[PDB]
């Protein structure tokens, strides 16, 4: 349920922003999205390890 959140980005669907936003201009929103998803995966990994 936490994967499918917007995280403050323009779009929530992964391939919607790949066709709606400019490919030179799509280096910020998806970067913040994958940074937040890496944070969520990291805290899930720590919880699973504990």
């Amino acid at each position: 349920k936490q994967l499918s959140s917007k995280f403050g980005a323009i779009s929530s669907v992964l391939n919607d922003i790949l066709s709606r936003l400019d490919p030179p201009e799509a280096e910020v929103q998806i970067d913040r999205l994958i940074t937040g998803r890496l944070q969520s995966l990291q805290t899930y990994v720590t919880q699973q390890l504990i």
Binding site: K1, L18, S19
Partner: protein, 99 residues
Amino acid sequence: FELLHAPATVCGPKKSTNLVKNKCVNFNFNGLTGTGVLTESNKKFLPFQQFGRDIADTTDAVRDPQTLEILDITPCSFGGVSVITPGTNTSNQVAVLYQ
């Protein structure tokens, strides 16, 4: 431009293609780009909506306005790959396994 949850009405004059089934392809339904294999939908609902969600908040229903037929969206083949190999100092024959 407003991205309210509604069926799309105005866009380009590009022509549509014929329907294809049982193949993992990429579909564009009223601006909803998605990838997966198309199958007939056993699910049903009251005929007043367009498309819905699931637990994963993904795409699981569609009703294209050309033909009033319910279609189901499901993922195609996916998963990791592993190898069964002996010591490389003795042999080189390996095996391919899909999980």
